[PDB]
């Protein structure tokens, strides 16, 4: 049971996979810009680029904030890779004007080479979780985030972070639906985050991915999550 | 039977899984350095690191060149990732001093997140083949390589590449032995490549992986393939 893409929506979708002004700005929001060229990475079995993922993640953050939903901060895709390679100092600034502790959930898209994964800080559940649609485990990435929270707590609020009851872990291959197409990895990251930010169980599989790509084109174009 | 590892060789191997100077250089060849720490990635159910894989691949390169064998160039592990993410321009230089067309076989280790796969260009067979020990399919990878050969042909030889008769393939799950242990994926890549570079059929299974790890420790230490 998934929202249908009507013939009319399919028309809005087909239209934007047409060729033409690769620069044409299709959607502008959250400081970002989605062009025809970005949107094309959603087509066929193209790899999503960062603009799509960031744009999507910000739609989830914008949707959190409606009542009943957990509140969400989405980190931009470059954040984790900058944190890992260069340390806390290189990312510390990225959070002026943001109190990372005043939200329920932090979303951290993780770019490992060609591949996408996702880490999630849930302050309600007091834990930090890694999701990889290939079933890889990334102990490190969660520790790196714990360590970041500590250094953010010290730097922003003048207090150490309380790790009591906090649990770091990777979701295993049988626990979340797995990819078959390498290029779908960014789609799994986005859709993992969709369910999680809604507190819904992750209840799709690889077969829904063609549908999800078409849908995300549509969603991005209207800045409306279905 | 696979070559036996004797009591005498077992002792070369036990000794190196000792603790001590994690930076002690055990093997130096091919501009690479294998330390005790790299070697420990072959133990247990540890994931092989890049240094091990590149070192092995270079042993295969060095073995080709003995007479009767097909000649082989192995690409470094970061090659495919760098090509995918950044395009031909970012890897063009890695082949100054190398005529990729003057060898029979090109080995391309493919790193997808935590996982290892392998692509092979065989100029005699006139085709490009993908091996994944979890049975995943990557059409795209083969095309990206065909695209690479064309760009390399133009760049190095001043001629377009002739794609006639050329075929792009993923090997199916029933065609090649599959992994059981995620940690052994790099070993599958290495061993697929061992067989292929020798023109022997891929004739092992997951049960052989413990043996293959101990043996690769021994082989790397002696810079000698059995």
């Amino acid at each position: 049971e998934f929202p249908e893409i009507t013939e009319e929506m399919e028309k809005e979708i087909k239209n934007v996979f047409r060729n033409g002004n690769q620069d044409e700005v299709l959607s502008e929001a959250f400081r970002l810009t989605i062009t025809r060229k970005d949107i094309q990475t959603l087509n066929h079995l193209n790899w999503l680029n960062d603009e799509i993922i960031n744009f999507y993640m910000n739609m989830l953050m914008e949707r959190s904030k409606e009542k009943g939903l957990p509140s969400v901060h989405a980190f931009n895709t470059f954040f984790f890779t900058k944190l890992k390679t260069a340390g806390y100092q290189a990312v510390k600034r990225w959070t002026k004007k943001v109190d990372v502790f005043s939200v329920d959930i932090l979303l951290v898209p993780i770019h490992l080479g060609v591949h996408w994964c996702l880490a999630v800080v849930d302050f309600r559940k007091k834990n930090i979780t890694y999701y990889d649609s290939m079933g890889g485990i990334n102990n490190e990435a969660c520790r790196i985030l714990l360590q970041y929270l500590k250094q953010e707590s010290i730097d922003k609020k003048r207090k150490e972070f309380d790790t009591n009851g906090w649990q770091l872990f990777s979701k295993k291959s049988q626990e979340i639906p797995q990819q078959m197409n390498g290029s779908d990895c960014g789609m799994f990251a986005c859709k993992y985050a969709d369910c999680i930010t809604k507190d819904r169980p992750i209840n799709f599989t690889q077969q829904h991915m063609p549908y999800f790509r078409k849908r995300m084109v549509w969603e991005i174009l209207h800045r409306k999550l279905l």
Side-chain angles (χ1 to χ4, degrees), chain A:
Chain A
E1 216 286 356
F2 293 97
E4 208 190 325
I5 306 178
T6 63
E7 283 166 272
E8 298 86 353
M9 305 162 51
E10 211 92 53
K11 207 179 173 310
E12 278 167 319
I13 288 161
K14 200 265 315 311
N15 179 87
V16 307
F17 290 144
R18 277 155 142 199
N19 27 103
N21 198 340
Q22 291 262 252
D23 286 314
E24 170 180 44
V25 181
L26 286 179
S27 229
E28 198 188 27
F30 330 113
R31 279 260 162 71
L32 305 171
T33 272
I34 299 302
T35 55
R36 204 151 197 110
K37 186 194 168 144
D38 299 305
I39 270 300
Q40 191 65 210
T41 68
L42 275 175
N43 207 351
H44 301 126
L45 299 165
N46 294 341
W47 263 258
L48 275 67
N49 71 9
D50 315 73
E51 275 267 43
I52 298 291
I53 298 186
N54 289 321
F55 199 94
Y56 192 71
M57 294 295 172
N58 275 260
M59 292 195 274
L60 306 180
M61 168 173 164
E62 189 165 59
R63 183 190 56 194
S64 83
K65 150 156 127 182
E66 70 197 35
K67 204 47 265 165
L69 292 181
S71 58
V72 166
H73 183 73
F75 277 99
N76 143 282
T77 64
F78 311 88
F79 165 82
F80 177 81
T81 26
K82 190 74 162 205
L83 166 61
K84 186 169 139 53
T85 86
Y88 175 67
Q89 295 295 330
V91 294
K92 162 190 162 179
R93 311 142 136 257
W94 294 40
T95 47
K96 26 176 281 324
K97 316 293 155 215
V98 164
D99 177 1
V100 100
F101 303 112
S102 64
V103 291
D104 294 320
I105 287 164
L106 306 179
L107 301 170
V108 177
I110 308 303
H111 206 18
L112 283 148
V114 324
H115 186 52
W116 290 100
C117 305
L118 170 75
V120 170
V121 183
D122 192 323
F123 293 104
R124 302 168 304 174
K125 293 182 188 164
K126 271 188 205 289
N127 87 35
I128 296 180
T129 313
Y130 184 83
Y131 300 81
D132 174 6
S133 56
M134 279 200 190
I137 299 160
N138 206 325
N139 42 100
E140 224 207 355
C142 306
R143 293 194 302 273
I144 277 171
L145 291 162
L146 182 57
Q147 188 66 19
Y148 161 90
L149 288 177
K150 290 168 180 175
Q151 286 172 124
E152 187 70 336
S153 185
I154 275 140
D155 195 75
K156 290 286 152 60
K157 276 176 179 296
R158 261 203 188 70
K159 336 156 188 166
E160 194 182 306
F161 196 50
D162 198 340
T163 54
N164 281 136
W166 279 82
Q167 238 171 228
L168 317 190
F169 69 99
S170 298
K171 287 266 169 186
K172 273 174 278 191
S173 74
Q174 69 279 315
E175 295 198 297
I176 60 197
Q178 298 286 283
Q179 69 186 45
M180 259 284 248
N181 309 134
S183 80
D184 281 332
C185 63
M187 286 301 312
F188 279 83
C190 284
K191 302 312 297 203
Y192 291 158
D194 178 21
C195 297
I196 286 159
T197 64
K198 254 145 125 186
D199 289 328
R200 286 295 161 176
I202 303 171
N203 222 70
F204 54 86
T205 81
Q206 177 51 78
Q207 285 207 48
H208 312 292
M209 287 294 157
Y211 158 87
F212 283 146
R213 287 162 167 272
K214 289 193 299 210
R215 189 170 143 188
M216 190 181 293
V217 170
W218 190 92
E219 283 169 338
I220 288 176
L221 287 181
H222 292 85
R223 209 178 156 172
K224 200 53 172 212
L225 290 166
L226 299 164

